[PDB]
Every structure is written in structure tokens, then in C-alpha cells.
């Protein structure tokens, strides 16, 4: 048993009726002094280390050649000038086991935390020494954390893509289905999660060019995609993860849901394919009034109207579809479908729930397209256009497939540094750089949408950690007040930075002129409502920091009208799974699942108290399962009103909660404006 593992295990040994939280500092100190400093390759000078890394196929010479070695040396000086110390053993362990650069035999350590941060900053700045130093200060202060792909792979020769979330539209054709399988395998090969919209595919028992009842439906494509993701398993390193989305009004919705039942047949069940259900307001209205609903065969609708069923507004088109004799449908019970959804989420956590009209009532790019589905993590909500992949000899009609770049603000560190504006703008610049430097050669729609939309996702994390370390309960109205003010400021400065980038480059995103940013409809609630804190305690948290006012929002609206907006999408709150340990932060804006995290690595068990947990703030670190999910919905809806994309919203349920309770949580989320629901986690 390692000495640091023993020291970390002494946290649970209760001395004087309290956990020994101070043992984790001893644990991390022992871990470093006994393992990391021993296994860290040291070089006489930074020049020798850099030469070894570039020449041994560890780094990329292209981005490092943009600086004189003096500038790189000063950047590394800035990283090491902070004397950053990992507060807990788990932070250092996670970094040096997941993100630190190791030798080709994975025996020694080439990169410390400072080296990784310096390389990421030098890649972000793209030749600017002052910008690189600013990125170094931002990341070594741990105010901004680039996503796991960006943080892990930036500046590495043998790297995967810096983007890991992709959203593909699948057209109703064998050519398009085969192309979707190919692109899914190519993107999973790069290490990215792939989400596929299956709503355009015609249902089971539909006609294929005069041969009726010949289509296997969305479940055959589901099996194809599941095997494609199983094959493209990231070189046998990490299991290939993909998601499939289907509209709740699709005829195959029940077959779509039956793929996740525990009793599912092996010719129906899918293993590596997550499922998400898209629910328009029409379905919730039908279930509310207990009227019997209809699911429609998409190809009949396409033949009758020339438009896909998911391309049309179900609120206005549902009655026309039902009254159309040439549109084929079967009766369903919407309440029974809702209960089936809740039962499936209780049993397996699936499907994801995307409230279509909650997303699109505040969507800023409805002119480009409505948001029809989400990503594998249920936070990316962007307009997509389906591609028409024709025969081999013909020319394909390339659409827009969603792929956004992820980054997370550390709410605790941004708040303690009083640097919401600077951190938000620098994170926007880094995400923009990642977007520009991303070129995917086997997903033409993804590449086209990356070049045109220039969409980024700037998330946040350590919300519960910041609140509990400041004596604020997560469910308290003061917590929602802080979230309101903080994310209003984040949105303000992200919009300002996007407009500044548009002014600097003289270009906006494609089809910006039709957006609500161009017409000013986006800024209505910001030029009409004041989002300053309503509590003196919360207003004191923002001391020394200018909270944007209504006049500031009017000035921003005028600036955006004059100069445009560079990013179609800017903010999305991803789960931030493994980077939260490195940042000593609670995951995303979700509340903590456990106060102290018990995990086993190898043959030794490890203990991870939540960051900042102590005796004084023990009960402010309320576990998510002990919380009222209605208040968590209230918090996420408070945040969601300032996030242009969605938020990964996990439901934390007790074992005593019934199907009716899960349905009530889902319906209250729909009522409160929640866009997506990620997971149903049961204790």
C-alpha cells in the first residue's frame, strides 16, 4: 500500500468526531514527493526538454515555431511563478493519470501541470507572447479549464481531435444512412461522441419505392450504428460512445424506447448507443388533457408536404397531419408514453429528454433551422441542416452538422479573482482558436458547420463548491440569485467578446443577419429586466466587479447591431467529468452526488472529499439525492435563461421515488423552461 494511499485513507478515520480532512494535503504531498518527482523526467534546461519533446514525436513543431525560445521560456516562467499546488491527492492523481504527458511506454512523466498549461496556452495564443502569458495566468489560477480533448491534446503530435461532441443529421435514404455510419465511425475514431438524429428516417413498415412494408425503421439503423460504434472503439482505448435521437411523434418511438429495456431481445437491444427523446409542447399538451395522441410515419408526411416531419412545427401541423388521410398514423396514449419514459429512466437512466419548444422558443437561429436534437451529453442545442448524400458519381448536398468546442469557467476561482469579464473573454478567444484550428476531413457537414457557424461552448463548473464554501445552500433562493447574476454577466461578456471578434475580423457567422441578435429580439429581456442580485449577501459576493445593467445591455445591443456577432452559439454547460478533479471543483452546475467520494483505483481504494469540504460547511455540501429536484430544476432554469445552448441536467432520484415522481420532475422541468434532461440517477 502506497504511503499517499494510506494517508488519503486516514480521512475516513474519524479523530475527535470529525474526518481528518487535513490528511489529503499530506496525501498529495506524499504522492508528489514519493512518486511524481521520482517519475518526472527532468532536463538541464527548458530548451533540451522542448527539443526532446518535438524530436521524439511528442509535440507539434508548427505551434512552437511561432515563438522565439525566449518567449516560450517566459511563458513557462509565468506558469511556474504561481507555484501551483494541488490541494487534494485526487486532483494530482487524476491529472498525472489522465492528462500528463507520458513516455511512449507510459513509464515516466514528461509534463507537469505547469508544462501542460504552458503548452496549452502557447497553442491558444498562436504566436502572441502576451496572450500566451494571459492564458497561462488564467489556467494556472484555474479560472478557466479547457475541455478534456483540448486540455489533453493541444500541442501534441499524436493527438486526437480537440472536439469530442458531434451531432449528425441522418436523411431518409440508404446513401445517407451509409454515410452516417461512415462519419460516425470516423468521428468515434477521433475519440468524439457522436449524436445522430433518426427522426427523418421513415418508420418500420414503410414503402421503399413502391414496395410497401419494406423498411426496418429506426431500429435497424440503430443496430447498424451500435455496431459501428462498437467497431470504432478509439483504437481499443476507450469504448465508442454514440447517441441516437428520435422525436416523440415518430412512429418508431415505442420501438426506439424498447431498445433500452432490460428484457430487450438481442436483435433489438443496443448496448453502446445512448437514446434521447425529443418532445414538442404538443405532446405535453396532449398528455396534460389525456387526449389520445398519434405518432406519424415520416415518409407519408414527406410525400404529402414535401418537408420532413421533424422539419415542421408540430404545434401547427399536428391537426393537419391527423386530419390528412394520406398521412399514416397510429393512436398512442401520451400519458402511457410518458409513464414508459419515466419507467425507462428509472431502470436505466435513458432516454435523454429534450423539450423541443423550450429550446426553440429562445433559440437565436431559428431562421437557419430549429433545434431538433442534442448531443451525447444533452447540452448542445444548435441549428442543423440535413445533408443529401447522393450516389457515388453525383455531387452531395452538404448541410450543417453540429460540433462545438467546450470550455469551463471555474465559478469559485473566477469569483474569488473578480475576473468574470476577463476570464469569459479569454475563454471565448481560446474556444474561437480551437474552432478555427479544427478541420475534420471525413465529416463534410461537420466541417462546413464549424467553418460557417463558428459555434463554441463556454460552460461553468464549481457552482455547488462555490456556494457551499460561501455558506449558501444550493436550493436556497440566494443560490439562484447568484446563478442569475453570474450567468447574466457571463452571457454579457461572451456576447461582447463575440461582437468584438466580429468587429476585429469584419465577419459574423453565416446567416447571422436573420438571427435574433441582428434584430435585437435577443436582448429584449436584458434591456427590459435588471439581473442584479436581489440579496445583500449575493450583492456582496460581486463586490469590486461591475454587474452589467440595463443601460450596459442596451449598449451591447447597439454594438451587436453595428458590428454583428461572431459565434452563433457561445455557452453550453457540459458535465465536465474528469477535469473537475484536476480543477478541485464540483462537476458542472450540478449539486454534488456525495460529500466524500469513495473510488477504487487498481487494487487500492481512494477517498475524495468534495473541494472545500470541512466541518463548518459540511451541511452546505448537501448531497444531490437528499435535495428537492424541484429546487434543482429552479436553479437550472435560472441558469438556462442566460445560456444560449442547453445544460447537462442530471436527475438525482431516491430509490423510494416512483414513476409518477420522475414524471412530475420532468413536467416541472418542462414548465420551468428546461431545455434538456440528461440522466436519471437513482440512489
Amino acid at each position: 500500500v502506497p504511503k499517499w494511499i494510506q494517508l488519503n485513507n486516514e480521512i475516513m478515520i474519524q479523530k475527535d468526531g470529525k474526518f481528518q480532512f487535513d490528511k489529503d494535503k499530506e496525501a498529495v504531498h506524499s504522492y508528489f514527493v514519493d512518486y511524481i518527482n521520482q517519475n518526472t523526467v527532468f532536463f538541464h534546461n527548458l530548451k533540451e526538454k522542448l527539443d526532446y519533446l518535438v524530436e521524439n514525436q511528442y509535440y507539434e513543431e508548427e505551434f512552437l515555431s511561432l515563438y522565439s525560445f525566449e518567449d516560450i521560456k517566459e511563458v513557462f516562467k509565468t506558469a511556474y511563478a504561481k507555484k501551483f499546488r494541488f490541494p487534494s491527492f485526487m486532483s494530482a492523481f487524476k491529472f498525472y493519470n489522465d492528462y500528463a504527458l507520458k513516455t511512449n511506454d507510459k513509464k515516466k512523466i514528461l509534463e507537469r501541470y505547469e508544462d501542460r498549461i504552458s503548452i496549452v496556452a502557447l497553442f491558444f495564443a498562436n504566436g502572441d507572447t502576451e496572450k500566451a502569458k494571459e492564458y497561462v495566468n488564467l489556467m494556472i489560477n484555474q479560472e478557466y479549464q479547457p475541455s478534456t480533448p483540448t486540455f489533453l491534446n493541444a500541442g501534441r503530435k499524436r493527438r486526437g481531435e480537440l472536439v469530442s461532441c458531434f451531432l449528425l443529421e441522418v436523411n431518409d435514404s440508404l446513401n445517407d444512412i451509409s454515410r452516417a455510419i461512415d462519419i460516425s465511425m470516423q468521428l468515434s475514431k477521433l475519440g468524439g461522441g457522436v449524436s445522430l438524429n433518426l427522426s427523418k428516417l421513415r418508420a418500420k413498415g414503410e414503402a421503399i419505392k413502391d414496395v410497401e412494408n419494406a423498411t426496418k425503421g429506426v431500429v435497424g439503423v440503430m443496430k447498424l450504428l451500435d455496431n459501428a460504434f462498437r467497431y470504432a472503439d478509439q483504437m481499443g482505448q476507450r469504448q465508442g460512445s454514440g447517441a441516437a435521437y428520435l422525436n416523440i411523434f415518430h412512429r418508431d418511438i415505442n420501438d426506439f424506447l424498447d431498445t433500452k429495456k432490460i428484457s430487450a431481445d438481442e436483435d433489438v437491444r443496443v448496448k453502446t448507443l445512448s437514446i434521447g427523446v425529443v418532445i414538442p409542447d404538443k405532446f405535453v399538451e396532449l398528455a396534460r388533457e389525456d387526449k389520445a395522441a398519434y405518432v406519424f410515419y415520416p415518409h407519408t408526411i414527406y410525400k404529402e408536404y414535401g418537408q420532413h416531419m421533424d422539419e415542421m412545427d408540430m404545434n401547427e401541423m399536428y391537426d393537419k397531419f391527423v386530419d390528412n388521410p394520406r398521412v399514416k398514423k397510429e393512436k398512442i396514449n401520451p400519458r402511457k408514453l410518458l409513464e414508459k419514459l419515466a419507467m425507462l429512466r428509472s431502470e436505466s437512466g435513458y432516454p435523454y429528454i429534450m423539450f423541443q419548444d423550450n429550446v426553440n422558443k429562445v433559440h437565436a437561429n431559428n431562421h437557419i433551422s430549429k433545434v431538433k436534437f442534442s448531443n451525447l451529453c444533452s447540452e448542445v442545442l444548435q441549428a442543423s441542416q440535413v445533408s443529401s448524400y447522393t450516389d457515388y458519381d453525383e455531387e452531395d448536398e452538404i448541410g450543417l452538422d453540429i460540433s462545438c468546442n467546450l470550455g469551463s469557467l471555474n465559478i469559485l476561482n473566477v469569483m474569488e479573482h473578480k475576473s468574470i469579464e476577463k476570464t469569459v473573454k479569454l475563454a471565448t478567444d481560446s474556444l474561437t482558436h480551437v474552432s478555427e484550428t479544427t478541420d475534420i476531413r471525413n465529416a463534410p457537414a461537420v466541417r462546413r458547420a464549424n467553418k460557417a457557424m463558428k459555434s463554441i461552448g463556454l460552460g461553468a463548473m464549481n457552482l455547488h463548491g462555490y456556494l457551499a464554501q460561501n455558506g449558501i445552500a444550493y436550493e436556497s433562493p440566494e443560490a439562484r440569485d447568484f446563478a442569475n447574476t453570474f450567468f447574466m454577466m457571463v452571457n454579457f461578456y461572451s456576447i461582447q467578446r463575440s461582437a468584438e471578434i466580429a468587429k476585429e475580423k469584419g465577419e459574423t457567422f453565416d446567416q447571422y443577419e436573420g438571427s435574433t441578435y441582428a434584430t435585437g429580439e435577443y436582448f429584449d429581456k436584458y434591456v427590459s429586466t435588471d439581473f442584479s442580485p436581489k440579496y445583500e449577501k449575493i450583492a456582496n459576493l460581486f463586490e469590486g466587479m461591475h454587474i452589467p445593467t440595463t443601460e450596459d445591455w442596451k449598449k451591447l445591443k447597439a454594438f451587436v447591431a453595428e458590428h454583428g456577432m461572431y459565434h452563433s452559439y457561445r455557452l453550453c454547460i457540459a458535465p465536465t467529468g474528469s477535469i473537475s478533479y484536476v480543477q478541485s471543483s464540483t462537476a458542472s452546475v450540478m449539486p454534488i452526488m456525495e460529500r466524500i467520494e469513495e473510488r477504487t483505483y487498481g487494487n487500492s481504494k481512494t477517498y475524495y472529499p468534495m473541494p472545500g469540504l470541512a466541518s463548518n460547511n459540511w451541511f452546505f455540501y448537501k448531497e444531490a439525492y437528499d435535495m428537492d429536484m424541484f429546487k434543482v430544476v429552479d436553479m437550472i432554469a435560472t441558469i438556462q435563461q442566460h445560456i444560449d445552448q442547453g445544460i447537462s441536467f442530471t436527475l438525482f432520484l431516491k430509490d423510494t421515488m416512483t414513476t409518477r415522481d420522475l414524471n412530475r420532475i420532468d413536467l416541472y422541468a418542462h414548465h420551468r423552461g428546461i431545455k434538456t434532461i440528461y440522466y436519471a440517477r437513482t440512489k
Partner: protein, 289 residues
């Protein structure tokens, strides 16, 4: 929550002795030493004798006292596998490897053997003590059954798996692997039936049933150590067999919903190579807030 799923897994694992041709084992059997052949024979007879008790008494007695048509059907299927499939398979292996007179002598020896008898009679004693409409006595018998299926067989299974992992006696090793795969699911299933009874008890009664299970495990384990040395010292394997017994004891405990008793150990690599919350309807006013 589980009987139909186990029904499916059980019936899809159905097999017959005739499917594996045994004669090709004679090509490796002839090359084993006397001690290896002796240990194999004794182990095989041990497994045969214990499995007969399970077919004639263990499974049918549990099927008799358990309520539920679907459970009785699964239990009947398991009893069938013991008597119709496993017993014939063990007989076939014996008839292939030894002449009639040698088989009779090995069974005479193992029938008189102190360590085999101790465990066989301990298990049978608990089956004979089940009383009509007494779920405590049924639970105790289920614990005994799980210990046989998931633990006591494994001091025996070790040797065929050891050969199987080396490329020796592959036909009989394939048969043993199929048998073992059946006993594994039998142990898991009976374990779930025992947990159902356990969960219906008070906290004091639970603590008392836990003490029973651990005490029984201890008695059987100490006898297994003696059984192991008695058979495996002559072929130098006892240390590794003991690790395998403890590893399988832990699996048996987990089948009964109990914590592992023994520290985790690695197993011999040759042997390794051988080896709904509650549906509630929406009653309106849940769509209004």
C-alpha cells in the same frame, strides 16, 4: 423481479453429454503420472458424489418448499440438469478414463474418506432439517445449497480446469466447464431466493442468520483446507487451490447478499485460462404547477 430472466438463461444453456466426444482424452491421460491420475480420479468422484446429493435432495427439496409456479419450474429445470445431464456426464468421463474395477475402488475410497463425508453430510443434514412452512429452516438449507454450488465444488473443479488450461484432458475439461457454468447460475439463483427470505426478517433475526452463514462457512472452509491437502499435496498444488477456494467462498457470500470474508487474491493463471422502482400512473394535476 428475476425468475423469468433466470428461466431464459437456464434453458438456453441446455446441453447433453453426447455432444462432447470423450475418447481423445486417452491421448493425454496416458502421459500423466500415477499421482496425477489418482488425484483426478478422487476429485472426480468427490464432485460426482456431491452432485448426486444435489440432484436427489438439494434441488428437489428446495423446489418443494418454495412458493411460486415459475420458481418451481426453474428449480425443476435445475434438478433435471443435475440428474439427467450432470450425473450422466460424470459417469461418461469415468467410463472413458478408468476400467470398471478401478471406478468401483475409487468410489469405495472416496465414500469412506473423512473430509468428503464431513462436508457431504453437513450439507445433507441441513436439507433434512427443512420444516414445512418454516422459512428460517428453508433459508438455512438455501445457504447450504449456495455453499455447495458456488464454493464446495471448486476445490474439485480446480484440477480439471488446471489440465484444461494446459491443453490436457480437453474433452472432459470442456464437459466440466459446462457443468461448472450450470452450478454458477444455480448458486446465483438459489442465492436470490435466500436473500428474499433474509429481507423479510427483523434486524435481530438478520444478525442471527448472518452468524449462522459465517459459522457454517467457517466449518466448511476448515474442512476444505484439510480436504485440499489430502488430495493436492501429492501433486504440489495445495497453496494455489486454497486461494481458489477463498475466491469462490467470496462469490458464494456475494450470492447470499453478504460481504466477502477473505481478502482478494490473484488466481493461478493456468486455471484462469481454463475458466424497476415503482410504476405509478399520472393522475392529473401533475401537469399543473
Amino acid at each position: 423481479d428475476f425468475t423469468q430472466m433466470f428461466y431464459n438463461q437456464n434453458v438456453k444453456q441446455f446441453w447433453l453429454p453426447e455432444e462432447i466426444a470423450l475418447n481423445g482424452d486417452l491421448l493425454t491421460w496416458k502421459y500423466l503420472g500415477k499421482n496425477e491420475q489418482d488425484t483426478y480420479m478422487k476429485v472426480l468422484a468427490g464432485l460426482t458424489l456431491l452432485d448426486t446429493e444435489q440432484g436427489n435432495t438439494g434441488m428437489p427439496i428446495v423446489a418443494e418448499h418454495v412458493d411460486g409456479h415459475q420458481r418451481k419450474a426453474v428449480l425443476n429445470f435445475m434438478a433435471m440438469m443435475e440428474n439427467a445431464v450432470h450425473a450422466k456426464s460424470y459417469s461418461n468421463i469415468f467410463m472413458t478414463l478408468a476400467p470398471t474395477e478401478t471406478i468401483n475402488e475409487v468410489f469405495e475410497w472416496v465414500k469412506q474418506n473423512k473430509y468428503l463425508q464431513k462436508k457431504a453430510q453437513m450439507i445433507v443434514g441441513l436439507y433434512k432439517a427443512i420444516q414445512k412452512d418454516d422459512e428460517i429452516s428453508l433459508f438455512k438449507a438455501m445457504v447450504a445449497s449456495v455453499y455447495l454450488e458456488s464454493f464446495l465444488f471448486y476445490s474439485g473443479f480446480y484440477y480439471p480446469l488446471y489440465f484444461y488450461g494446459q491443453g490436457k484432458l480437453m474433452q472432459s475439461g470442456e464437459i466440466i466447464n459446462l457443468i461448472l457454468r450450470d452450478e454458477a447460475i444455480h448458486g446465483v439463483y438459489v442465492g436470490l431466493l435466500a436473500q428474499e427470505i433474509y429481507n423479510k426478517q427483523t434486524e435481530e433475526k438478520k444478525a442471527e442468520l448472518r452468524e449462522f452463514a459465517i459459522d457454517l462457512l467457517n466449518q466448511l472452509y476448515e474442512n476444505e483446507l484439510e480436504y485440499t491437502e489430502d488430495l493436492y499435496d501429492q501433486v504440489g498444488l495445495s497453496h494455489d487451490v486454497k486461494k481458489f477456494i477463498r475466491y469462490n467462498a467470496n462469490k458464494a457470500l456475494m450470492n447470499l447478499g453478504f460481504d466477502p470474508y477473505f481478502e482478494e487474491e490473484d488466481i493461478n493463471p493456468i486455471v484462469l485460462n481454463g475458466l424497476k422502482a415503482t410504476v405509478e400512473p399520472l393522475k392529473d394535476d401533475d401537469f399543473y404547477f
